[PDB]
Design a protein around this ligand. Structure first.
Ligand SMILES: [Mg+2]
Ligand SMILES: [Mg+2]
Ligand SMILES: [Mg+2]
Ligand SMILES: [Mg+2]
Ligand SMILES: [Mg+2]
Ligand SMILES: [Mg+2]
Ligand SMILES: [Mg+2]
Ligand SMILES: [Mg+2]
Ligand SMILES: [Mg+2]
Ligand SMILES: [Mg+2]
Ligand SMILES: [Mg+2]
Ligand SMILES: [Mg+2]
Ligand SMILES: [Mg+2]
Ligand SMILES: [Mg+2]
Ligand SMILES: [Mg+2]
Ligand SMILES: [Mg+2]
Ligand SMILES: [Mg+2]
Ligand SMILES: [Mg+2]
Ligand SMILES: [Mg+2]
Ligand SMILES: [Mg+2]
Ligand SMILES: [Mg+2]
Ligand SMILES: [Mg+2]
Ligand SMILES: [Mg+2]
Ligand SMILES: [Mg+2]
Ligand SMILES: [Mg+2]
Ligand SMILES: [Mg+2]
Ligand SMILES: [Mg+2]
Ligand SMILES: [Mg+2]
Ligand SMILES: [Mg+2]
Ligand SMILES: [Mg+2]
Ligand SMILES: [Mg+2]
Ligand SMILES: [Mg+2]
Ligand SMILES: [Mg+2]
Ligand SMILES: [Mg+2]
Ligand SMILES: [Mg+2]
Ligand SMILES: [Mg+2]
Ligand SMILES: [Mg+2]
Ligand SMILES: [Mg+2]
Ligand SMILES: [Mg+2]
Ligand SMILES: [Mg+2]
Ligand SMILES: [Mg+2]
Lengths: 10, 52, 76, 77, 64, 51
RNA sequence: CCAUAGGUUAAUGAGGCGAACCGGGGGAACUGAAACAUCUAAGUACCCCGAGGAAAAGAAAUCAACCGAGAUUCCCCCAG
RNA sequence: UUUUGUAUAAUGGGUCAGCGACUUAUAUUCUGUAGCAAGGUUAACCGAAUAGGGGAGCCGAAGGGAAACCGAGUCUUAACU
RNA sequence: AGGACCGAACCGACUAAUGUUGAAAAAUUAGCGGAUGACUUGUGGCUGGGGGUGAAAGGCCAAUCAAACCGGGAGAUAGCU
RNA sequence: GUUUAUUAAAAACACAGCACUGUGCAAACACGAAAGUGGACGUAUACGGUGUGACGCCUGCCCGGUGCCGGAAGGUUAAUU
RNA sequence: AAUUCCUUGUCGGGUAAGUUCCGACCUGCACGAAUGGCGUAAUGAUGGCCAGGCUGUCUCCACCCGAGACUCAGUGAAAUUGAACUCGCUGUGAAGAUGCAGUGUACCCGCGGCAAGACGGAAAGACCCCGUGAACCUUUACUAUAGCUUGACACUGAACAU
RNA sequence: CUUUAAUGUUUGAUGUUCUAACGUUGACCCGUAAUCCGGGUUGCGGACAGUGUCUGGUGGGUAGUUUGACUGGGGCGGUCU
RNA sequence: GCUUGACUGCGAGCGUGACGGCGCGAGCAGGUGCGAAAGCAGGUCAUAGUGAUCCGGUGGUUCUGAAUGGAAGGGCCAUC
């Protein structure tokens, strides 16, 4: 599994 | 709409009636008109009544 | 805004033109006010709709002091 | 459990209605009561779990007659 | 399984001799007084089902 | 035999068009559906009785 | 106080397992309705009890219609 | 593949081989075809049994009307040219 | 005497670096806090899923938690790709 | 002291203290179709709930609204008859 | 001011220079008294600010010691990948070109390096929108319901007083 | 007829005096090596309490759902015949 | 001034709508009104003043009436 990387913008 | 619908019932006792409207503020007196009655096949006087 | 409203078009105008053969009762033109007036063998409806009162050819003509336009039916 | 020892009445299931007829499952239980019945033959009081409808049949049928049918089913007292 | 007829449509359409379906006109239930007599008189007789809706009616009525 | 190559003339769509209800597996509206309106056999009133 | 409850023996019987079918006690929701409450799904899934090789039902307080039929069960129609 | 529009710097695929998606049942309509024909055809079931029997039924040859009713007419209406 | 002080074991996990297809699916190194107590730990036991437990963060309940896992309804449904 | 095991240890939570309120013990309350159990083998100097949060100085005005408590004359009003 | 939008409010202190900090002002956009107010020693891996000490934090890096990186021998992955004979520029073009047009440049092939580009790799986008999607949660949304409460009847009988 | 007063006729409303249903998580005895249960004795309460059916009220305590579209993205505004 | 044609049954032939539908209509039948009559009148100069179906209510109706006679209920007409 993984943990949705939070390098996303807004 | 504040004018209310009324029914005009034939005096011949056939039970046929017409429907129309009348102004309640004025003309309190009942409405009398000579209209054709299909049951007796003649023009007779129709008298105002209450729709119910 | 407080605008942007209209009604569906009522499809007025001339339905049968000059020289066309029509059956009795067919409406020739639907109008607002007497743009055309009823002539021979032509009736006028309660909304000034001119209808044919007999079979025949549609003819347009201009007569009278008011320089009006009249529609008549020549029933052969 | 909630079972009448005379009539055998047991809980039954039904629906709660409403003005909109919505149906929700419910239970109907008998009007059971623990009563000490006087049996003349043994000159004793025997306690029974009976419904209110069961009480009516005891007067009509007699205390001895009803107990005889229960013995046919077979149970403790 | 057998096809089930739409029971709602079966109570309003009857098959005719040449395969058509007849129905009563609408707009004649409870606001009819304000309607002109000519309008009410024309709505009283039975009417024919239009050609556009013929396919839909036959689908709802497979056994009749 | 649809969906069996280009030459068959019914390939890659099976005669169902492009992404409609008819192209979905088990897709399509029920009998009498008029796009959302109550159908003609419900616009019109009931009449008569069965003898 | 008799008794009764209770107690001790002795005889029998039952215990558990097992596919489906059967009867009974309980009993959904997703879904469909292009939403969603009535409704549908469905007395289905599932749980519980009991039985048999089948089970259940069964010998009219039944239907018919002024003529009549004559327990129950099952099949095809009647009929979408 | 999806689009008004993709060399597109839009999606898909490292490659090969194998497998992998419009079927089935019932009912209904239409077309084609075959049979019979104002008739056509049986179902369950029986049956040495794909035969034969079984026409129980079903469709069609008459419709109109809400219906009672009438009928090559019928309904509408007091009545319809 | 003390939920007292400094400080090992023990326990915690504040900062930084490394590592980030790890030595390790959360650690190591150097520091850090508590360290006789509301401490810590062993072995058993009890509380079960709309329920538990929670000095309370929607936390935790077998690497899974704004409703665990397994099987069933079930080929749920998917006007979407 | 406790906390988001695995990006947040904090001013968050807890906390002693304070106040309100419920609760007379077959207590209130809670877990349980029920029995029963916890509360508690306790008895208002007790227990539960709520908010506040050592200590110091203090905590003013509004009961209309919404709740809660008390009253019951009148108005209205279910099953039942 | 964890509360002040205007706003870096105004004044004072600190600095060479202070939108932060400290002290006041009150003009409280939009503090306020147990959803407590104001103070408060001690405590705090608590937040902000200042000073001394201290230093490669920096001016501005230099050298050195180890472990890798590099070479040899042995063992021997991974994510990715339509196919490639895989240059620059300008222009064009599903509108930011290794692949089109024009033009320029370029012998064939490794090794050590740097990451500008290949809209590089990772993961059917978490933001936005949509579906007559899902779920939790809130309430004077709707419809119910457990529970609580009211009365009638039953379990449940007999005197007396108003 | 009104104001009514007395008088005759009927359901109820409380209060009380009861016990015999019912209650006793009062005492005592037995089952009995037993803080369960049952039976007995007695006391207290008592036609209540409590429970069943029906019924009014209350009820995010717990459920099942709804909560529109158009729109120079959406929301807001506006609009819907 | 006099009146109720703001008539009942119908309707050749057209118009406009995908449809549901909406609109126009001479003429015909029966009975009217105004005119001496020819004739005109099936509301208003015209084009807005509006809401389908289901369900329920009212009046009328020899249409129906689950054995038969009724009735309930349903149907039709008028109408809410
Ligand atoms: Mg093609
Ligand atoms: Mg398509
Ligand atoms: Mg649905
Ligand atoms: Mg056997
Ligand atoms: Mg590409
Ligand atoms: Mg790929
Ligand atoms: Mg054929
Ligand atoms: Mg045969
Ligand atoms: Mg026959
Ligand atoms: Mg005819
Ligand atoms: Mg200490
Ligand atoms: Mg220490
Ligand atoms: Mg310390
Ligand atoms: Mg976990
Ligand atoms: Mg859930
Ligand atoms: Mg599962
Ligand atoms: Mg299912
Ligand atoms: Mg699936
Ligand atoms: Mg963490
Ligand atoms: Mg911890
Ligand atoms: Mg941390
Ligand atoms: Mg606090
Ligand atoms: Mg007040
Ligand atoms: Mg108040
Ligand atoms: Mg500011
Ligand atoms: Mg300054
Ligand atoms: Mg300051
Ligand atoms: Mg405040
Ligand atoms: Mg306060
Ligand atoms: Mg500090
Ligand atoms: Mg210093
Ligand atoms: Mg590989
Ligand atoms: Mg290249
Ligand atoms: Mg370019
Ligand atoms: Mg290289
Ligand atoms: Mg680099
Ligand atoms: Mg998504
Ligand atoms: Mg939407
Ligand atoms: Mg649902
Ligand atoms: Mg929208
Ligand atoms: Mg006029």
């Amino acid at each position: 599994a993984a943990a949705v990387r939070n390098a996303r913008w807004a | 709409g504040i004018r209310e619908k009324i029914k005009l019932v034939s005096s011949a006792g056939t039970g046929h009636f017409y429907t129309t409207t009348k102004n309640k503020r004025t003309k309190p007196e009942k409405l009398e008109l000579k209209k054709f009655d299909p049951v007796v096949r003649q023009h007779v006087i129709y008298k105002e009544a209450k729709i119910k | 805004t407080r605008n942007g409203r209209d009604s569906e078009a009522k499809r007025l105008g001339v339905k049968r033109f000059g020289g066309e053969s029509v059956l009795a009762g067919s409406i020739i033109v639907r109008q607002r006010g007497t743009k055309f007036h009823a002539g021979a063998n032509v009736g006028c409806g309660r909304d000034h709709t001119l209808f044919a009162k007999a079979d025949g050819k549609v003819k347009f003509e201009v007569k009278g002091p008011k320089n009006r336009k009249f529609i008549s039916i020549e029933a052969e | 459990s909630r079972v009448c020892q005379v009539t055998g009445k047991r809980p039954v299931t039904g629906n709660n209605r409403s003005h909109a007829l919505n149906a929700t499952k419910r239970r109907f239980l008998p009007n059971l009561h623990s009563h000490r019945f006087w049996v003349e033959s043994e000159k004793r009081f025997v306690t029974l779990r009976v419904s209110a409808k069961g009480m009516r049949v005891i007067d009509k049928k007699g205390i001895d007659t009803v107990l005889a049918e229960l013995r046919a089913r077979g149970e403790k007292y | 399984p057998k096809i089930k007829t739409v029971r709602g449509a079966a109570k309003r359409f009857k098959k005719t001799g040449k395969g058509g379906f007849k129905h009563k006109h609408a707009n004649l239930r409870h606001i009819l007084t304000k309607k002109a007599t000519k309008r009410k008189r024309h709505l009283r007789p039975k009417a024919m089902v239009s050609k556009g809706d013929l396919g839909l009616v036959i689908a709802c009525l497979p056994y009749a | 035999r649809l969906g069996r190559g280009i030459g068959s003339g019914l390939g890659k769509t099976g005669g169902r068009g492009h992404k409609g209800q008819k192209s979905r597996s088990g897709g399509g509206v029920r009998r009498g559906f008029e796009g959302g309106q109550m159908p003609l056999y419900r616009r019109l009133p009931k009449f008569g009785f069965t003898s």
